[PDB]
Amino acid sequence: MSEAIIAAARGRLISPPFSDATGDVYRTPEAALPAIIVELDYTDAERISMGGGFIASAELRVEILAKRDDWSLLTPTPANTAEGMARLAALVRTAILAPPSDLSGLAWSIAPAGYEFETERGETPLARATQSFALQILQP
Amino acid sequence: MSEAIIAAARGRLISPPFSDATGDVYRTPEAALPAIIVELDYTDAERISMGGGFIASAELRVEILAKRDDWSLLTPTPANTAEGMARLAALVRTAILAPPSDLSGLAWSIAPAGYEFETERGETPLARATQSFALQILQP
Amino acid sequence: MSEAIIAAARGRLISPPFSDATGDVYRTPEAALPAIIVELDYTDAERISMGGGFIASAELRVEILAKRDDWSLLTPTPANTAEGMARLAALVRTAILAPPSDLSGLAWSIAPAGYEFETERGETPLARATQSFALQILQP
Amino acid sequence: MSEAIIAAARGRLISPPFSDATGDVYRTPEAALPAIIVELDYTDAERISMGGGFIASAELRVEILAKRDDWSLLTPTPANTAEGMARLAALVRTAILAPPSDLSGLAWSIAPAGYEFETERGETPLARATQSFALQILQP
Amino acid sequence: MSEAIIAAARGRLISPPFSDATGDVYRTPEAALPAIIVELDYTDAERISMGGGFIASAELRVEILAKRDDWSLLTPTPANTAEGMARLAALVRTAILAPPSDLSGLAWSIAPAGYEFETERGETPLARATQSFALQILQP
Amino acid sequence: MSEAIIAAARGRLISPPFSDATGDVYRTPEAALPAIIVELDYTDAERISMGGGFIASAELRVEILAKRDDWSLLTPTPANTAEGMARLAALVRTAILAPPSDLSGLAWSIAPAGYEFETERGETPLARATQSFALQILQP
Amino acid sequence: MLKGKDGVVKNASTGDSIGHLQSWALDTQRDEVSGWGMGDDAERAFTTVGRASGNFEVYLDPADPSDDLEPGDLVDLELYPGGESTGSGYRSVAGALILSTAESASKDGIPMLTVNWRTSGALPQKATVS
Amino acid sequence: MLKGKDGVVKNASTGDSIGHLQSWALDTQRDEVSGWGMGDDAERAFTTVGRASGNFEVYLDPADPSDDLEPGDLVDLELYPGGESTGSGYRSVAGALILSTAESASKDGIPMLTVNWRTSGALPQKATVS
Amino acid sequence: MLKGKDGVVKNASTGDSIGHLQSWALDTQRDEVSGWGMGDDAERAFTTVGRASGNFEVYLDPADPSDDLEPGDLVDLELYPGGESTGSGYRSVAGALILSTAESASKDGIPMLTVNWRTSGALPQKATVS
Amino acid sequence: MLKGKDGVVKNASTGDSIGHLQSWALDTQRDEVSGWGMGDDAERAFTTVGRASGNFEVYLDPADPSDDLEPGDLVDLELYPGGESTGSGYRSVAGALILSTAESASKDGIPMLTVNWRTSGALPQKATVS
Amino acid sequence: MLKGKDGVVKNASTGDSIGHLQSWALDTQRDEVSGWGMGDDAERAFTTVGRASGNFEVYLDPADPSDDLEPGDLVDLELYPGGESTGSGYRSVAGALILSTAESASKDGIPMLTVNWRTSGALPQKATVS
Amino acid sequence: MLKGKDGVVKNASTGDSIGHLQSWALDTQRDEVSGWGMGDDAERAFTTVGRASGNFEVYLDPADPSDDLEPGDLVDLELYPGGESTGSGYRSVAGALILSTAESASKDGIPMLTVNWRTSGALPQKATVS
């Protein structure tokens, strides 16, 4: 159930103080400097039991775009892309990979599939961070 | 038998209130905002028994293109691509993966091979959803 | 022996009432609306016995190009690419995968490796169908 | 020893009545309509025995380019690319994969790795045929 | 914890007498002829224990850009790219793969995944060296 | 230790009577018709023992560029690319894969990973030959 | 060619399907006695007595009767290889005695239970469902 | 080099092909007696008596005679390795005794039956079909 | 379908979870006695006595009670397949006797300990947690 | 380093190569007797008697003598590891006794026969062909 | 979670680390005696005596004491699973008797030696390093 | 860390290297006797007698002494794990008795011979080459 998992993510990632927009093609803003977007992506699948059941292999991708003081919350040198991206990412990782059961349950495993920091040259420097989380969800 | 399976699909996917056109190259309309198309795709194969039989590995791809209130049937925020695509997709998944035997029988396994939501920037926003279903069909 | 297998194919696929031309680069006609072409393709290989023998893994590709009433022989909606392509293909499959021994013998296994329907936008709509058949032939 | 194997090939493929030129970049002639070229290609490798030895995995590629009556030696329809290419290729296969020991010995296995027929649109039609033969040769 | 590992790297690679800048898109200087940059890159992952734990597969990439006498510290012919790159790299390898425990501990394995020397034609010749080090870090 | 292995190679390949230049980007000469260049390339790696050790998988690539009489040292037809390249290559192979222990020791295995002959159309014809040798070297 | 994803095994006495099952198996065997004499080319043989056994595997369950079965219990088992659809054959074993049960788990997997049974005093009887 | 996809095994007595078969096997064995004496370099040997056995596997069937065979049954089996085409050799075993049968299935697979047989009082006889 | 990544095994007497565990297993078995007579088609059977055994694997630990258990020790083990959440079943074995322990390591891996236990005088008792 | 794709095994008595063969094997063994006494560091040993055995596999054949060999037959076998080219060694076994033969097939494969032999009264003798 | 790449095994008597080691193992076992009576549901058990064994593998060495150990030797072995860092536990076995040693090599690999040991008269004692 | 691609095994008596070898192995073993009494925690043990064995594999050879060795032969074998370079250790076994030899081939492979040996009356002696 993507909507529900996305909804959990929507609640789980709305906490950073900035709007999260997912799949808005027309939108490509720079005004919303701190940027968050969560994607449920794809689900591959296999049978469960004899007499009925299905399970899926699914990937959740979280992407963050940022500039300036958003990086500089506390520690020095978050302008450095790596430190800044890591600083936002680890907490984000804990947000999604949190202890609460509802968030964990529909997700089953919540392992970090991948991590990345990327650099795009804008006046204000913009950097992209990806946090793939692999969740296996039983097909309803 | 692609035609029969496609026919089952044709019956199974004609229910959303909009026409389904498959493989029409010349046609690329925007007037039919809610859009559905079902493809039987490819069949790989292996032998059955001694003395004769064949079975195939086959993929069925279902694609949906949509804009505006088609997304907004009931729940809020289906403009969000993920929620909207999921909303149409899950029911579609149940349509094809339905309990009726005839639909299930020629199909054998009906597992969701893949899922996706895609974004194209039109005045009205158009979003593409793919629902690969893997069916193994005995070659007649 | 490609020529012989191709010859068997030549006899086996000449039955649809239209000429079959294979590997004619200069030729790319639209006048021959119903179109058939058979290709022996490639042969990979391994040893047989001790003291001498060789066997090959080989692929035979059959391609069909069509427009209009060629699709509409009997059942309705063969304009739909999938139904039309399937309609011609299944019979073609039976032609090549026929019971006669000579056709079967040099071919050994005759499994359908793959299937496809494709769409090209001509005034008259033209659609391409591929029917790979895998034949393992003992190298003479 | 590529030169020796190539030399064996040079003797073995010089028999068709036309010159064989290998690796001549500047040369790209149409006057030599029937065309033959043999390439020793690459050698991958592994150890032999304890105390010393090496063996290689090697590929020999034979390519034929042809037009007109060269195809039409005896049987009808060799203009058809497949028949024509096969007609030249099988005999070529026997030439290289011949019984003589010297040719076989430095070559060890002489299996046909691959086969192909290709089409290029010249006034006179030109068609390319590839006959990869895999030979494992002990490194001297 | 990328920041900490990057911080260890930051301390560990700051020793060559030149600044290290990581992920600065706008910056592409030639004034800082000797150049160093360290990237934590990506982390794939798997479960630990029953009841909780996670571990990651991670890659650390170190890149060096250089010209002139930076190559020529002591031995002759470091202009030769290979010697020069190796000369800087081996010591760098020892820096990161050093005996100190803190550096080793968060890193666990510190194996050299890959090595490379690259050539770009500037008035002063510039050469790029990559030293991937694979560190498996327990997810906090 | 790339420098040392490269140094061994430097001594081992300096014998053909022409200069060897490695990684010179600006340089692309035609005056040095016979051409030799040796590259240590990349090193992948794994642990050794318990308590400490590392070993690497490494590739050494040797490339030769040549024209005219350099090919024609003794035997006829070395203009033919294959014969000429092989003629230089086999001796080169023996040079690097020589019996002397020092050359062999830091190299451990010296197997020919790959071989190739290539053709570029210059007034004087230039041909490229590659002789990958795989050496596994213990990381110091 | 039954599908095999629809197989249902039910305890006949309490009328409950066992649960989410991974796999089932059945076997029937009859022992052999062979005798030959001096001067004889081949050995003659005969079959004396018969036994049957089988096993089934299911994900561990606290909400189903999967939980209840115990070693030593005597149960009546009806097994439908192709399901309960009309005209589908069912193998019915009476007086099945459950010799052993085994529970296992791993960090990355669902807990599983395997039950092994033998037949006592009876032989499995094939029959066709209405 | 028979093709092996055309092999047919038929019960001779009731004249029915067994069904969709996966695989067949046959074996023939003769026991050995070895003796050596003090002072002898090699050991002499002789063969005394012979037995034959085999097994075949088929997808589970409720519409074919595959269903009927039972452990303990005595049957006549004619096996055609290369089919029934004229001039194809057939191995005929008389008085085959079916020792055991085994049914199995999994969630992702078709149900299968394996039958094991021995010969009683006879040895397989090769013959060539008309 | 318990998750299986939350399983906790605790020593009941000292109240400590064992440690970072890789896997757990349990088995219960009852022996069989079969008898048949001259003239009887099937063999009757009965189950006589019961034993239980199991094993668990954990990364080697110097900071946890994982370290303390020793061969020959008698311990009370409560195993929670699905965790200690309310309503989750727990298998409790009393008087578990630890027959053997095995420590191993490799150059590329974490050190591991495997403990094997048997039951003495008691049988595992299923129960449901509050 | 014989090539091994040219090996020919021929029945010496009837002078026919066996057929399309997949593989061959031979073995020679001599038994050991060991004795040690009180107060002795090492154990002395000696070899007493010798036997040889081997097996060969060939695609099933109705047109060749592959078909004829039977368990219990006594045959003379000459095996050429490197072929019959002059100067190639041949292993000749006299009085080979064929203990067993096994035929098998599968849906996707060619039928195969495996023959196992032992030596009676003789030991394999190496010799070099003219 | 000890790292396992830092494990050191040292011969206590001569104070030398063994050498470049691939892997180590240890095991401890105590035998079981079970008894049940007529009319009893479960079988009681007790543990009687204990033995320990282990093995270690190292690349073949002519420059280290790896070379010296011999079958039959009695040695004192101290094994540090996590290294000799302060506070790291060490398993010390006294009177270890080396039953067997095995040397092997292949064309593509480094020569290796495997040593197997048993304990005589003592049991491994856990202790914590200073 | 000897390289292992340079290992040479030579027959000491005739002074010839064996041939193109794939692999070598050696083992040394001493038997164990254990005794415990009523009231004792651990079991004491001692080692009584020693034997050694090994095997080597080589491509089949008609031009080398590889061909000559036969089961039952007594030979002196000197094995150099790291080659004959000065200062390289050699394992020398005297009175090696060759119990068995095995020849095999396949359609796609080179013929191979495996020789197995035991020691009679002596134990392998390590020594360092000049």
Residue numbers in the entry:
A (entry chain o), B (entry chain n), C (entry chain m), D (entry chain l), E (entry chain k), F (entry chain p): 1 to 140
G (entry chain e), H (entry chain i), I (entry chain j), J (entry chain h), K (entry chain f), L (entry chain g): 1 to 130
Give the exact sentences the study uses for this entry.
We recently characterized a novel roseophage, vB_DshS-R4C (R4C), that could infect the Dinoroseobacter shibae DFL12T, a ubiquitous group of Gram-negative α-proteobacteria of the Roseobacter clade. Here, we report the atomic capsid and in-situ structures of the tail machine of the marine siphophage, vB_DshS-R4C (R4C), which infects Roseobacter. The R4C virion, comprising 12 distinct structural protein components, has a unique five-fold vertex of the icosahedral capsid that allows genome delivery. In this study, we use cryo-electron microscopy (cryo-EM) and structure prediction to determine the atomic structure of the phage R4C capsid and the in-situ structure of the tail machinery to characterize the distinguished long rigid tail.
The adaptor docks to the stopper hexameric ring, with the latter formed by stopper proteins (vBDshSR4C_009) that maintain DNA inside the capsid. The stopper protein, a crucial module for head assembly, shares common structural features (anti-parallel β-strands barrel) with other siphophages, myophages and phage-like entities. The R4C stopper protein, with its long N-terminal extension, folds part of the N-terminus as an α-helix and plays a critical role in connecting the adaptor. Intriguingly, the R4C inter-stopper contact area (~274 Å2) formed by the N-termini, short loop, insertion loop and β2, seems too small for complex formation: we speculate that, similar to other tailed phages, the stopper proteins may exist as monomers in solution and form the stopper hexamer when incorporated into the head. After head assembly, the R4C stopper engages its long loop to fit inside a groove formed by the terminator, joining the head to the preassembled tail. As we described, the R4C terminator operates as a docking platform for the preassembled head and tail. Despite low sequence similarity, the R4C terminator protein shares a common structural topology with that of other long-tailed phages (e.g., λ phage gpU11, SPP1 gp1771), and integrates elements of a multi-stranded β-sheet barrel and two main helices at the periphery. The central α-helices and β3 cling to the neighbouring terminator surface, which is composed of an N-terminal helix, an insertion domain, and a segment of β1. The interaction between the R4C terminator and the tail tube relies chiefly on the tips of the terminator long β-hairpins binding to the minor groove, which is formed by adjacent tail tube subunits. Residue M50 in the β-hairpin tip inserts deeply into the hydrophobic cavity at the interaction interface to further stabilize layer coupling.
